[PDB]
């Protein structure tokens, strides 16, 4: 049971949206496309702030680094690129991995970036040390699809891997603090942390149609969420509302009750397969945004 008030704020068509991110203080959403293009939209005015043809290959990963006025993106050409979004200047451009970059995470306070790659590793970059490669995390046995800092202890992070595991690491140590054997036999596409201090929870999404909730102190599966009818691309906890949001190649977003783990609403936004998700970091208007085959949509909830 739950009362939801979902409003479409802004939706627009584009090539396939593989990455998406909210700016914390400007009403902006970043989209990164399979076409090599990235776009920054003001979703309140519905005007493009800035766009870049970054490369000719897909750009699967993109994040704002607001405290530097940067966007950072990673692409199938193996390269990490950083742009100032006020001038368009390309700040840095380097080969990060010898294979596809699937995911990028930005430390909340330190000048650290994590990149997850088909080269089976996560790499740690320090932009206050000339973008030095500070550490490579080895252990996974297939593509690393998703990396995410623990917002409550960002000296640790999680990596989700097609080898069917999540690994949780400590910066400066070479082996996982623990490995979760998820039982998601088609691999792990996405991993996310519950942001609030009251629960030590993470969540994983898989091609095997399931979503799983984990207690990372007991390493136990709290619940399994079933309902999607094709590959689940992502699942995340909402930063303010008691819900989980997932999206799937079945073309839907699903909103789940985070206490009962039952589905509360299924949305078909009409843009075919769903690939990526973002939630506004301060919970402004409970905004969420998802990228799809045929564009993106920004929704306000509650």
Numbering used by the authors: 0 to 301
What does the paper say about this structure?
Overall, the coatomer functions to retrieve the escaped “client” proteins, such as type I membrane proteins, from cis-Golgi back to ER by retrograde trafficking. In particular, the S protein – a type I membrane protein – is delivered to the ERGIC from both the ER (by anterograde trafficking) and the Golgi (by retrograde trafficking)3,10–12.
Therefore, we generated a β‘WD40 Tyr33Ala mutant and determined its co-crystal structure with the clientized S heptapeptide at a resolution of 1.8 Å. Although the S Tyr1272 side chain was indeed closer to the mutant β‘WD40 surface by 0.8 Å, overall, the Tyr1272 side chain was still >4 Å away from the β‘WD40 surface. A BLI assay revealed this was insufficient to enhance S-β‘WD40 affinity.
